[PDB]
């Protein structure tokens, strides 16, 4: 276990360390295409089908 | 204050055929006119124009004509015609305004005490509204100006009656037009308003680029007032306003949704009446 | 300074720069507001001072030349969003 993976026993403990994220988010990177599904919305059903 | 004017589209006509009388020599002759209206409220009403003799040099702009004989019979004819009416202002037909412009609404703020000019425009390149009216304060300055005079900004509209509306949209006829169209004219409004934006910033750094570096007057005039422009600009993907779009923008998604689960529905009475239409007719026939 | 990211100041680099204590920055800030130079507010329970909106100064050569460089890369990004509007219906609006 100390080789393979870490884990290396120190004063009387197998340590963990980090195991997070931030999670960060913008939301308006689909202000561009939730706009072209808009502009689809009205392009079908404005055309003579 | 004035706070708007109302411009009926008899004139913004009655002005380019003055322009369409003198326009022969071609080069420049810039159209002064006279302008009627009326002391209606705070908000004021257009109504009519005449013209009025004016020349004016190319160095020196120093040296112009206003008839005072030439305005006073005509306006005379006028006010015999129409009681109603009387004078509130001029035009000219320029289409930036010049140095001057000043000392024409100096002459005549003796015929009414707020002469108002408006600005129009023959060729509008720009393809936005045109045809924009100032009035002249006096601002005076920190600087020590004993008269800090320059016009200021009014907005305007085209105004509209019953009779002129039968008059004007007869001639649209001679191009095609939607204005019956629902949400075509709402993306080209769009598109139109945006193009407006481009076409002010484009403007904007051609002012910028030469007060930086070589030759302009520097003054504490626009370039702290524009700073404040740049105060605003709204931050807009951050913490809580992402909770405006997905709490606002999916409440008119359901909207939309219900209009779609009709409008389908609405179609498929119109295949069965049409299909028990089609074959019974057929069966009865053969 | 800051060009208005993190312009929620905390009290520190306030009772730093103005060389003052804590417990009296707030009736600093609060003059002026009171006088009208700041459009900010206070909060207490992190005692970060929130700015919003500032007096408007005088700059020079480099000023302009940053000012430029937001606005040539505000403009041109407008450009380009308003063509992928129109690229994106050609013959649909008429």
């Known amino acids: 276990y100390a080789k393979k993976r870490g884990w290396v026993l120190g004063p009387n403990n197998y340590y963990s360390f980090a195991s997070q994220q931030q999670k960060p988010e913008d939301t308006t990177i689909p202000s561009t295409e939730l706009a072209k599904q808009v502009i689809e919305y009205a392009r079908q059903l404005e055309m003579i089908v | ?286 | 300074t800051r060009p208005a990211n993190h312009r929620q100041l905390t009290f520190e680099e306030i009772a730093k720069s103005a060389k003052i204590t804590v417990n009296e920055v707030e009736l600093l800030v609060m003059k002026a507001l009171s006088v009208g130079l700041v459009k900010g507010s206070i909060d207490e329970v992190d005692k970060r001072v929130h700015m919003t909106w500032v007096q408007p100064r005088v700059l020079d050569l480099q000023q302009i030349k940053g000012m430029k460089d937001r606005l040539e890369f505000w403009c041109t990004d407008v450009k380009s969003m308003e063509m992928l509007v129109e690229h994106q219906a050609h013959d649909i609006l008429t």
Not at chain 2, 184 to 192: A, D, F, G
């Open chain 2, 1 to 286: 204050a004035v706070q708007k004017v109302v411009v009926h589209p008899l004139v913004l006509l009655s002005v380019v055929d003055h322009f369409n009388r003198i326009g022969k020599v071609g080069n420049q002759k810039r159209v002064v006119g006279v302008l009627l209206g009326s002391w209606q409220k705070k908000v004021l009403d257009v109504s009519n124009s005449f013209a009025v003799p004016f020349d004016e040099d190319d160095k020196d702009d120093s040296v112009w004509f206003l008839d005072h004989d030439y305005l006073e019979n005509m306006y005379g004819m006028f006010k015999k015609v129409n009681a109603r009416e009387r004078i509130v202002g001029w035009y000219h037909t320029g289409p930036k305004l010049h140095k001057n412009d000043i000392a024409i609404n100096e002459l005549m703020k003796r015929y009414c005490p707020n002469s108002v000019l408006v600005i129009i425009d023959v060729k509008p390149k720009d393809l936005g509204l045109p045809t924009e009216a100032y009035i002249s304060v006096e601002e005076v300055h920190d600087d020590g100006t004993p008269t800090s005079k320059t016009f200021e900004h009014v907005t305007s509209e085209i105004g509209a009656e019953e009779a002129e509306e039968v008059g004007v949209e007869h001639l649209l006829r001679d191009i095609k037009d939607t204005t019956v169209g629902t949400l075509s004219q709402r993306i080209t409004n769009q598109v139109h308003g945006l193009k407006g934006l481009n076409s002010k910033l484009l403007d904007i750094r051609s002012y910028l680029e030469k007060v930086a570096t070589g030759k302009l007057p520097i003054n504490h005039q626009i370039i702290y007032q524009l700073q404040d422009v740049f105060n605003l600009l709204p931050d807009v993907s951050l913490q809580e306003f992402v909770k405006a779009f997905y709490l606002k923008t999916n409440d008119q998604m359901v909207v939309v949704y219900l209009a779609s689960l009709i409008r389908s529905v609405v179609a498929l009475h119109n295949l069965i009446n049409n299909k028990i239409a089609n074959r019974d007719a057929e069966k009865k026939e053969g």
